[PDB]
Structure formats: structure tokens, C-alpha cells
Amino acid sequence: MKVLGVVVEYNPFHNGHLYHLTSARELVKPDYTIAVMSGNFCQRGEPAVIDKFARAEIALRMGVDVVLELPVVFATQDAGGFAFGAVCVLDATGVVTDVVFGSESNDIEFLQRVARILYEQPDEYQKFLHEELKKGYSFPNARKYALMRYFSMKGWNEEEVLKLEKSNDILGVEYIHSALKIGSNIRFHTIKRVGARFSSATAIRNLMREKRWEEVRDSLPEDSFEILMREINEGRGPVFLENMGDFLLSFFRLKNMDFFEKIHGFSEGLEKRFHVCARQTGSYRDFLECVKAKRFTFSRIRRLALFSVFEVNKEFVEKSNTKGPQYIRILGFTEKGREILSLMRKKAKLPIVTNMSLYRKVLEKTDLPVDKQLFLEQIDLDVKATNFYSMFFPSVEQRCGERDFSIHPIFLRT
């Protein structure tokens, strides 16, 4: 039988997301659909505008059967790490046969060809890559130029490689590359991205900031808007990066360069830039602009700020990017979802965590040969991120307790 996996953030779940999910299901005709979803922080280094429990419920309402958390250590990395974590979780379920992602080109054959080269690492490609890195280009640029030069040597059209300047197709190549690395049999598919009625998740979050609520409503499915309003009515949203800005900036003034040198992703003089800009600027917005230069994107800097505040160190990320996620966290499922979750319990290659109050017992008793210390470090980060995030709920009445322990997986009858 067929099971559709999808890799998602849903920050917030909007019409474009409904378009993807519906397209994916109609294309593949799966018996079940499983989503692996970023938690309370997304890949761009921002908080989710409402939390993962709310967004899990929306995913269920929109046609997902089971929602899994993509652990924080992957959810907040650049595309390579993000993709690797996401494919490991989907593959580890033991049931996912097909994955569909939105694509600018909608050219799956092109993406598979590129993923194969990056997987096999032919020496001519490596030679080109090394030269470009030596020339001082950043890895994404160097890889691009190296692939182009490789395409040319092969008598292919190198201009086709320009498709990899588009974010979603880059991610696509990384999903496929990850599946190749871990030996997964998952079939990958593209669907065409449309619009940016379809506003980007970032535009919609900006509409919320400006309190243009009618336009927000026009951008989201009804159940998504309803849950968004629910969270806002109870003071659990919206949550914006700028709400965390004074914390981040103040926290960096507590740290010296020695600290940042241990944090994953620091290189190219970024330790000194974090150290100096933290002391010379008075707001996180100004901080970001101070650290920012030609060779750094805002998303890279914002990711580094999250890695710093959560003390996500180099050794921990190295192990996570080698051994992968050590557990499957269930954020929610439907009555129909029970059926595929039951099969996962038989077929999964990682321990399944439903009841967080039990996760240490799950680890102690599992037959699966996981890395115990890595498991504990990974899930501790997931919990820490939730606990930190909840301090920024607008209403103080919502800031108590550990929501990973107090909120069980969302459940909806079918």
C-alpha cells in the first residue's frame, strides 16, 4: 500500500499549503498521509507564529492523518540538515512510500540527476567544487558553479543548473540526496508551486503584524484561520521574532567569543561579529543589520542566534547529522490515523514517543539500537525550545508549565 509523506512548517497553514497537500494526495492516491513538521521554530530562524500543537491540529483538519515533529536540531538548520532530518524521520516510520514537495521548476528528473551527482561525488565534480571554494565562493555558490562546470564537461546545458537558485528546488535536491545517503526506497515527486489568493507564509505573517485580518482570512483555509483566531483569543499568539529580540540581544551580551566558537554554524569571522554587534547595538533588528553583510543572509544569522541561545554546539549537530533523529515524536493523529500509527509501531526503525511523560521509559526499554545520549540531548532541545517559546505568549496566564508534557498528541475523530 501507499503512504504519502510531506515535509512542512505551516507557519501559518495557508492556501498554498492546501494546494500542495491536495495535489500531493490526488497525484499519489495514498492510503494515508503523514507530515513531519517543524515545531515552535522554523528553518528561517523565526518562531512559529502559533505553536506546534495548534499547527498540528490544523494539519489534521486539512487532511493529514498523522503529524510528527521534526526535531529542533534539524528544523532550524540550513536546507541540507533540515532535509536530512526530515527524510530520516519519514523513512524511519517504516511505512512512507512516496514524498511530494512543491517545486519552482516542477522538474523531478532534473532534481534527481543533481542529487545523484552530489551523492556519488564524481572526482571531476569534487575537483571543480574545491577550486570554487578555494576561489572564496560560499558553499551554495561553489556547488552551483561546480555543477555548471560539470554539466558543461558532460555536454549538457549548464543553464539548467540555474534552477538551483530557487529555494524549494534546492530543498528538493537535498531531500533526494538524503534518501540516497540513508538508502531509502521512498519515491519523490514534485508539484508546481503557484502564486508567490496565494500569499507567502512570510507575507501573511506581515499582514498579521499590520493587523490586516481580512486579508489574512483571504489567505488561509477556514479551519486554519479559525485556529489562528483561537490562539490569539487566548493570548497564545501571534508570536513574532521581534518579541524575542531583547532576550536574544541581552543573552549575547552575556557571552564571549569562546562561547560562539563552540556553537554550530560559526565560521568566517561570525563569532567576532556576534560579539561586537551585540555590544554596539540596542535592538535585535539593529543587531541583525550589524552582523549582516554581503556574504551572510538574514536567515543564516537568525539561525545562528537560535543555535546560540539554545546552546546547540558543533559536536551535537555533527552527531545529529550523521546518526539522524533518534525518535519519532507524534504531535497528533486522527481516528483514521490510528490505523497507520498502529502499523508504524510494528515497522518503525526509531522509538515512537506519544506520551512525553514516558519518553525515558520508552528509551530504557526499546529494542532499537539508538544512541541514548544523543536521543536525550535531541529531545531535551525539543522541550527546551517549547518552554522558551511559551514565555513569549502574549498573555502571562498562558506561560506556565511544560507544554510538551501537559499537551498530549492532538486527536480528532473522523
Ligand X SMILES: Nc1ncnc2c1ncn2[C@@H]1O[C@H](CO[P@@](=O)(S)OP(=O)(O)OP(=O)(O)O)[C@@H](O)[C@H]1O
For residues 2 and 31, the answer to whether their CB atoms sit within 8 Å is yes
The site map against ligand X for 201-240 (x = CB under 6 A) is: xx--------------------------------------
Decide: is 9 part of the binding site for ligand X (CB under 6 A): yes
Nearer to ligand X, 198 or 310 (CB): 198
**Which of ligand X, its own copies, none lies near 200, with the C-beta cut-off 5 to 8 A by kind?**
ligand X
Cβ count near 402 (within 10 Å) = 14
Q: Write down the least CB distance from residue 256 to its own copies, Å.
A: 7
For residues 219 and 15, the answer to whether their CB atoms sit within 8 Å is yes
Decide: is 8 part of the binding site for ligand X (CB under 6 A): yes
Which residue among 22, 135, 153, 195 contacts ligand X (CB under 6 A)?
Answer: 195
Q: Is the peptide bond before 30 cis (omega within 30 degrees of 0)?
A: no
Phi, psi of 371 (to 5 degrees): -85, 115
Decide: is 16 part of the binding site for ligand X (CB under 6 A): yes
Nearer to ligand X, 202 or 406 (CB): 202
Nearer to its own copies, 111 or 407 (CB): 407
For residues 190 and 107, the answer to whether their CB atoms sit within 8 Å is yes
3-state class (DSSP) for residue 248:
helix
Label the pairing between strands 66-70 and 328-334.
Answer: antiparallel
Decide: is 22 part of the binding site for ligand X (CB under 6 A): no
**Which of its own copies, ligand X, none lies near 250, with the C-beta cut-off 5 to 8 A by kind?**
its own copies
Binding residues for ligand X, how many (CB under 6 A)? 17
In whole angstroms, what is the distance from residue 102 CA to residue 172 CA?
A: 8
59, three cell numbers: 494539519
Region from 8-16, 117-125, 153-161, 404-412 binding ligand X, contact rule CB under 6 A: 8-16
For residues 61 and 332, the answer to whether their CB atoms sit within 8 Å is no
Decide: is 36 part of the binding site for ligand X (CB under 6 A): no
Decide: is 188 part of the binding site for ligand X (CB under 6 A): no
Q: Write down the least CB distance from residue 195 to ligand X, Å.
A: 5
**Which of its own copies, ligand X, none lies near 190, with the C-beta cut-off 5 to 8 A by kind?**
none
148, three cell numbers: 555548471
**Contact positions toward its own copies, by CB under 8 A?**
246-247, 249-251, 253-254, 256, 279-283, 286, 309-311, 380, 384, 387-388, 391, 396-402
In whole angstroms, what is the distance from residue 160 CA to residue 280 CA?
A: 44
Residue 400 gets which letter from DSSP?
-
179: region left, alpha or beta (phi > 0 left; psi from -120 to 50 alpha): alpha
Q: Write down the least CB distance from residue 371 to its own copies, Å.
A: 19
- Closest-by-Cβ residue to ligand X is 102
In whole angstroms, what is the distance from residue 1 CA to residue 357 CA?
A: 33
Q: Is the peptide bond before 238 cis (omega within 30 degrees of 0)?
A: yes
**For residue 47, which of 394, 409, 328 has the smallest C-alpha distance?**
394
Q: Write down the least CB distance from residue 75 to ligand X, Å.
A: 10
**H helix runs in 30-154, sequence order:** 52-61, 72-75, 79-92, 108-120, 123-134, 139-153
Region from 14-22, 122-130, 318-326, 330-338 binding ligand X, contact rule CB under 6 A: 14-22
Decide: is 110 part of the binding site for ligand X (CB under 6 A): no
Q: Write down the least CB distance from residue 183 to its own copies, Å.
A: 36
Q: Which residues bind ligand X (CB under 6 A)?
A: 8-10, 16-17, 19-20, 101-102, 168, 193-195, 198, 200-202
